[PDB]
Every structure is written in C-alpha cells, then in structure tokens.
Design a protein around this ligand. Sequence first.
Ligand SMILES: O=c1cc[nH]c(=O)[nH]1
Lengths: 50, 218
Amino acid sequence: MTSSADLTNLKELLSLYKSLRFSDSAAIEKYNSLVEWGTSTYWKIGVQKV
Amino acid sequence: MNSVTVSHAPYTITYHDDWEPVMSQLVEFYNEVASWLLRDETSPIPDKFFIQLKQPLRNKRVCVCGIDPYPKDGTGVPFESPNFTKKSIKEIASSISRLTGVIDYKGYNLNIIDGVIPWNYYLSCKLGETKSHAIYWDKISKLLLQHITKHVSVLYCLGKTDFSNIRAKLESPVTTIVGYHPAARDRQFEKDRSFEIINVLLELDNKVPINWAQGFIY
Ligand SMILES: O=c1cc[nH]c(=O)[nH]1
C-alpha cells in the first residue's frame, strides 16, 4: 500500500485512464489488471474496468 | 456551530452542522462509558476530546487517521504540537519537506491543510499509555469514522499493526491506505510515499490533490 512500487503502479493506471484509447490487447488488459490490483489493494478506487 | 449536552465531562459537545446525523447516537454512547474513562487522567483533557467535531466535512477530500492521541500533551487536534516538539509531527514535516522542497520552516499542522481532516480513531488515552482507552471508545470510534468516510475520497491510516483490521470497522467501502507510523523501525516511514499515493488516488477519483505544503508554519 505504502511503497514506491505502489506509487509507480497508480501513476501508470492514471496515465492509462487519461488516454482511454487502447490500440492493442496489451494496453487494455494492463489497464484492467491495474484496476483489479488497485481495487484489491485500496478497497475502492475511482476508476472502473472497461 | 451547535451543541449537545452529555452527563459527564466535558458536559457540552460543540459541533459543525455536517456532524448532525451522528450526534444523538454519540450522546447515548458517551454517556454509557464516560465515567469509567474519566477515572484516569487523559491525553487530551476531557474539554478537548471532541474539538475536531467543529470541523466541516463536506469540503474534505482526505482523512489522515492515527490510532489515538499523543500519550502526553494531546491538544484534541490529532498530531498537533503547538511548539513543534513531538517526534511524529516533525517526521511528518520532514517527509513533506522532502516532497515539496520547502526546507526552512518552524512548524507543521495537518489541521490547516485544505481538504484534510486529521483524526484519531480513539479520542483519548490514559496519560502516558497508548491504546489504554480502546475498550471505551470502540462503538463511538466506528460511529464517527464511518461518518467521516461518507465524505472523504481517501482514508489514510498511520500504523500497520494498529490498522491491520480497519476494513472490518467500516460499512461502505472507501479508498483506504494503511502506511507506517512515524516511529516505525528502520526509517520505514521515511521511505513511505503515502502523501503522494493519496494524491494519485484523488486524481483517479477526479478530485483535487492535497497541497501538503499548506501545513507548514513559518
Ligand atoms: O494525535 C496523534 C498523535 C500521535 N499519533 C497519533 O496517532 N495521533
């Protein structure tokens, strides 16, 4: 929850949220897997899987 | 600013309108426990137990929550040290210094930051003894923290052990980050990036990040 590692994942989740223009399967799967991790880790986050 | 009357010191509790829905239940709970808890000398004094209920909630994005007051010299404002002498607040201030690049300051207070409500899970301890009043506050602590978390986007709790079970104390899910207490071993609080994490989570919820440098006293 704490860490530099957590902060890096959230920042990446935020960057992908701001684009929302996924050009491949990787990016959309990454985005959704980050949502899952964020929701599990912090209980509730402001963004949703797409 | 409204008030309600209880049967034990402090006898009157003054509260901002945003707290109105919990106040009658607070009165009932406080009346059943206060005599026991008042057998001890406390941090803070009884006349300061509830001073954070004067803060509005509707403008709050983040709750910064410690377990209970300073074992001594609690003011009723969580983490607040008027002459900037307590280790915990100095550590919090050094982290924010490092974050923001503000190097010269004379103090820090979480309670003067826009969008932040500093909170203590338990509202007193017997003087010199952390968590000594957990058993008295329990139902009140849930009542008040649940009310806070209807308003804030992010709950930040300080103390990995103290808050390991915090989710069970809450009804509705809320964004919850548990980081280290400022006195954790091995400089772990120094390495913790909770203030930055809180801001990214706020952006994920389309909220304005906290300006942590507003806490400085010059
Ligand atoms: O008010 C305070 C002071 C120190 N530690 C806390 O958890 N709360």
